């Protein structure tokens, strides 16, 4: 003698069952000065999210000799100007971020 009540949509993702007594109160102060609207993007900033800090390849830095790149791009006549300059970029950016503080889940978003 029950009714259950778990719809096919429900079992997949979730059910809210929330908004306790004071919960609505808290959100009231949030909208006090919250104004709905937007400006236009400042342009020259919309662009694809970069993946690797090198050109035409993904900078996979690891111990493994088959995925070092560095251990893989020394066959040239000399010390390839590309990997070394790329590395310092990752290090220097971290220090500058620490000066400001971003921790954007990775140095890439910065």
């Amino acid at each position: 003698e029950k009714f259950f009540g778990m719809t096919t949509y429900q079992q997949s993702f979730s059910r809210p069952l929330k908004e306790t007594a004071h919960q609505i109160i808290a959100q009231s102060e949030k909208k006090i000065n919250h104004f709905a609207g937007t400006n236009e993007r400042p342009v020259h900033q919309q662009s694809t999210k970069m993946t690797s800090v090198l050109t035409a390849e993904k900078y996979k830095n690891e111990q493994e000799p088959k995925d070092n790149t560095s251990i893989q791009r020394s066959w040239l006549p000399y010390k390839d100007k590309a990997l070394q300059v790329a590395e310092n970029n990752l290090i220097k950016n971290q220090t500058l971020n620490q000066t400001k503080g971003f921790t954007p889940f990775n140095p890439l978003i910065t």
């Binding site: 003698e1 009714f3 259950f4 009540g5």
Partner: protein, 430 residues
């Protein structure tokens, strides 16, 4: 939200209705007091499907209950759960039917039908989008069989677009309930294939023999038989009233169940069916349900569904369950017994699902049957009509209120036509 209305006449039609609301009331959490006491919040998102609103917080079901004598209806609300029906919705005369169509259709039937039409229109126009009509009445009785057809003809003309279903109890040859059953019964069946859209007979014979071979209760009462039927309807409108995956409204069944205009008779049954003693020891799993649904005896129609082949059928599986096994079981059954299914219409089994099983069970199925075997009763009903009319027995009262021999030949005329026109598809080969 595609609400519908219920119109039932005659005590037989009255009895079925009484159980239906109570069972329907429980599923949507309506107590005899009517104050909502549900647990989950899914029990109100479609309360409008079968209930209106009122001041004070009480839900008044939308039903039309009326009969040609006061005694029966004085009892329907006499017991519990009867207080829900609004008094304004009751209409009752003071004459009586007496198991004759003439009195309840032309002389007395006509003199009171006007009031009923007034009541129905008020509610019917109330909804936002009418979704259909469902009528419970008895073709072997006086008030029901006769009054129902006249109301059915009257309503359909005014609303040529909506759909209509029918639940009637054709009389069984083995056990009798009235001697004038053949006359009024046959004269009534001819008046459905012309106006009504869907017909799904129910046989009291199957009710008795089902109770004693599967349920195994010695003393069964009329309470037991009604409960089974009440569930039968409860599954038809299940998808229309709850969420799910593949919803199928009342109309959706028609386009998939009726292949030709004059072939809209169905037979229904309920599964699973298990007695108290066997309450627990069986495995409520998909394979068990599929086998007993098509069983020879589990069906509720006096006809044997293995004496011909099926044209089309659909299943309304209720309650959470896997989808893959549902299709495969349907696929397997359509194969292992091909000879029992018509050949020129491929994939002749429908599927449908809902996300809420009935209270008190984990899996539920409501089958709909459009079988060539349905003609077997018509031979039994028609054949008796011939001999009885041979000697003009009991006829001179039928002619007593303007009812004349013209249509008696005509009315029986179509019944033979329907039976023969129903059989030629059995032997039809592409």
């Amino acid at each position: 939200m595609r609400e519908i209305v219920h119109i039932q006449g005659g005590q037989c039609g009255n009895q079925i209705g009484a159980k239906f609301w109570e069972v329907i009331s429980d599923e949507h959490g309506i107590d005899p007091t009517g104050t909502y006491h549900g647990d989950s919040d899914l029990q109100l998102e479609r309360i409008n499907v079968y209930y209106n609103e009122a001041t004070g917080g009480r839900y008044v079901p939308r039903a039309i209950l009326m009969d040609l004598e006061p005694g029966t209806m004085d009892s329907v609300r006499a017991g519990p759960f009867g207080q829900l029906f609004r008094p304004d919705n009751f209409v009752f005369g003071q004459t009586g039917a007496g198991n004759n169509w003439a009195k309840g259709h032309y002389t007395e039937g006509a003199e009171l039908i006007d009031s009923v039409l007034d009541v129905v229109r008020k509610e019917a126009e109330g909804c936002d989008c009418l979704q259909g009509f469902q009528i419970t009445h008895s073709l072997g009785g006086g008030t029901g069989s006769g009054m129902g057809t006249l109301l059915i003809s009257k309503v359909r003309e005014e609303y040529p677009d909506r759909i209509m279903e029918t639940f009637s109890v054709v009389p069984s040859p083995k056990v009798s309930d009235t001697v004038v059953e053949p006359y009024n019964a046959t004269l009534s069946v001819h008046q459905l294939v012309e106006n009504a859209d869907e017909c799904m007979v129910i046989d009291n014979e199957a009710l008795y023999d089902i109770c004693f071979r599967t349920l195994k209760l010695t003393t069964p009462t009329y309470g037991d038989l009604n409960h089974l039927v009440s569930a039968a309807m409860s599954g038809v409108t299940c998808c229309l009233r709850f969420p799910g995956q593949l919803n199928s409204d009342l109309r959706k069944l028609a386009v998939n169940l009726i292949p030709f205009p004059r072939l809209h008779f169905f037979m229904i049954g309920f599964a699973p069916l298990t007695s108290r003693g066997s309450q627990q020891y069986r495995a409520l799993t998909v394979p068990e349900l599929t086998q007993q649904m098509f069983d020879a005896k589990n069906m509720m129609c006096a006809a044997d569904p293995r004496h011909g082949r099926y044209l089309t059928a659909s299943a309304l599986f209720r309650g959470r369950m896997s989808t893959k096994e549902v299709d495969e079981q349907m696929l397997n059954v359509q194969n292992k017994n091909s000879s029992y299914f018509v050949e020129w219409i491929p994939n002749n089994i429908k599927s449908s699902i809902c996300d809420i099983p009935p209270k008190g069970l984990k899996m539920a199925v409501t089958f709909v049957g459009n079988s060539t075997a349905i003609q077997e009763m018509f031979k039994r009903v028609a054949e008796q009509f011939t001999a009885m009319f041979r000697r003009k027995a009991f006829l001179h009262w039928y002619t007593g209120e303007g009812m004349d021999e013209m249509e008696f030949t005509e009315a029986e005329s179509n019944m033979n036509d329907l039976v023969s026109e129903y059989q030629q598809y059995q032997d039809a080969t592409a």
